Amino acid sequence: YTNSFTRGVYYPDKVFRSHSTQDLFLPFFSNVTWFHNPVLPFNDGVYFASTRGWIFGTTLDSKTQSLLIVNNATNVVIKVCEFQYSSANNCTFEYVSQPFLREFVFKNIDGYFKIYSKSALEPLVDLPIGINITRFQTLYYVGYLQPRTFLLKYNENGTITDAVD
Amino acid sequence: NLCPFGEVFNATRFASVYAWNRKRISNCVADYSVLYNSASFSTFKCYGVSPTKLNDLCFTNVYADSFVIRGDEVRQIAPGQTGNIADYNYKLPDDFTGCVIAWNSNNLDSKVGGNYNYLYRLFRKSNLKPFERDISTEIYQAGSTPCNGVKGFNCYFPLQSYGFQPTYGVGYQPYRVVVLSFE
Amino acid sequence: EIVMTQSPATLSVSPGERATLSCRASQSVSRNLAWYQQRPGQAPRLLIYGASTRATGVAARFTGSGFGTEFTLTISGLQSEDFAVYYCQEYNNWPPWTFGQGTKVEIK
Amino acid sequence: VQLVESGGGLVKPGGSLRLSCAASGFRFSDYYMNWIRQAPGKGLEWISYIGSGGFATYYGDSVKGRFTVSRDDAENSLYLQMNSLRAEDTAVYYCARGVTSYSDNSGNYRTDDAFDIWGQGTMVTVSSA
Ligand SMILES: *[C@@H]1O[C@H](CO)[C@@H](O[C@@H]2O[C@H](CO)[C@@H](O[C@@H]3O[C@H](CO)[C@@H](O)[C@H](O)[C@@H]3O)[C@H](O)[C@H]2NC(C)=O)[C@H](O)[C@H]1NC(C)=O
């Protein structure tokens, strides 16, 4: 399906308190894809929302490394192995912490994989994954990020309140 | 979180050279000042990374290759060298980085009557590629005549034993080794 | 001579429950421990070696953890086959290796 | 991946017996091997150990001088020799095998010594009847 929105604003990849930013953002009234589990492309970033995990990668095979996020009832596990899962070889980075309307933004820039969750999506965590990411699958609404200039109104305690395309 | 150097330099028993162990180290805050400034290590010498500036650089992965070799024989754990260890058991590249400590251990390893548990290869066909252990112990035929896989004449078991005793000299005592590798 | 003691006497749990087992060492072995399951009338079988790695033919419902002196094994979702006796043995040296005294899991 | 044992039987006190187990399905000359034992209705006890090609023999506390272990790699066979037997060592001897090396997913070339695939039993009863 298709839908429109007004949201998708996160803190502009920088942790300053206070503005205009030329970053990867989600257009306000844009086409978002209402779904009811295909392998969607990643492009440069995705907006995810739903009312329990993700698998990222390029080929999603043992030829290349792939990102894997799973949420238990008590714990979240992030691993990047050469998943087939049927076989796990290599297994470089592993992250373990508390589990994650629930809306997420994923971007993979400069070898870092950044996550924002909840508008004003607070930064959840960024990960030094250091792999290429092109296509993805959900283990919901899916949008795609666009490199456009934004204006962000901070509200005397950070907390980006309003935004302007 | 300081990654476990104490689980590699203080392990209760080390692994013989022909099957040298290995451990990968990542996601830690490792200090090499504690390693460098200890009077126990009777050898510390390394390459492209001077020991003074070890902790001020960070790599992606750090490896640790540990074994036990003869005291005299430790001169071959270095690039460009050739002999028994460097040619059949543990061979280093030419552009090596990271470095190698080796402290005497005769109080720990050798026991009266002998300690046969440390073995080293002695016969092979072709020189080892760097960082390539082999465990297969198929009998080495010393010549053209085959022997149908029996230990005998012109056929030998390729693993022979050090057999340390505390009454040996420094030229034969056991010198535990560790060989850090950097990204 | 590293004396190993398990000392839950007789575990008594109904099927479908998540039970834990204890194996306490007198000294530090710190990565060298194994867990065996010995169904009555059968030969034993290796489950965990290295205190955390599973064997080849083992389901994911067996997990073990520990380091230094305290080691534990957790069994979640018991079936009928999984009522046996369980041992732990330490091998952080050459000479004699000691087997744990073994504990039994019954049906409640 | 198949350990089959034989030679178990009945012996009188003060006699001798020679157990053996033959293995197939792997390179036998690259693995540690060693003998476990179990008294009737008690916990397992460890008894012997052999290395990678002889010249590594070790032994238990209670069988220090009575048991000789040796292996013939070429025949894919293994032997345990028992001398000057007594009566309280009745048990069901197994012949285990140790995972010599376990190359984990990344590096970790760790050398373990746990008893992976075992054999069956060979009842050995010692009594004067
Ligand atoms: C585990 O998967 C990763 C892929 O993410 C592999 O790491 C990569 O290994 C290659 C081969 O050594 C390296 O990339 C390049 O090495 C050449 C050396 O000729 C160098 O000139 C290039 O500048 C580049 O570094 C690098 O170590 C690494 N690259 C990455 C991070 O993608 C690794 O090989 C896999 N492990 C296994 C099981 O083989």
Residue numbers in the entry:
A (entry chain N): 28 to 45, 49 to 66, 81 to 95, 102 to 134, 160 to 175, 189 to 206, 221 to 241, 265 to 290
B (entry chain R): 334 to 516
C (entry chain L): 1 to 108
D (entry chain H): 2 to 130
Source paper text:
The SARS-CoV-2 spike protein recognizes the host angiotensin-converting enzyme 2 (ACE2) via its receptor-binding domain (RBD) to mediate viral entry into the cells. In addition, B.1.351 and P.1 carry the K417N/E484K and K417T/E484K substitutions, respectively, which drastically alter RBD surface electrostatics and lead to immune escapes. We also solved the cryo-EM structures of two binary complexes: BD-667/S6P(B.1.351) and BD-804/S6P(B.1.351). Together, these cryo-EM structures provide detailed structural information for eight SARS-CoV-2 B.1.351 neutralizing antibodies. Structural analyses suggest that five of them directly antagonize the binding of ACE2, whereas the neutralization mechanisms of the other three do not depend on ACE2 blocking.
We also characterized two other mAbs that do not compete with ACE2: BD-667 and BD-804. Like BD-744, BD-667 engages the front chest of RBD; but unlike BD-744 that runs parallel to RBD, BD-667 docks on RBD in a perpendicular manner. The epitope of BD-667 largely overlaps with that of BD-744, mainly consisting of RBD residues Glu340, Thr345, Arg346, Asn354, Arg355, Arg357, Tyr449, Asn450, Leu452, Arg466, Thr470, Lys484, and Phe490. The unusually long CDRH3 of BD-667 (22 residues) forms a long hairpin to attach to the lower chest of RBD, and at the same time contacts a neighboring NTD. It is also unclear whether this interaction can occur on a ‘down’ RBD without disrupting the prefusion state of the spike trimer. Similar to BD-744, the epitopes of both BD-667 and BD-804 involve Leu452; and the B.1.617.1 and B.1.617.2 variants showed substantial escapes from these mAbs. Obviously, the L452R mutation would nullify the neutralization effect of many mAbs that target the RBD front chest.
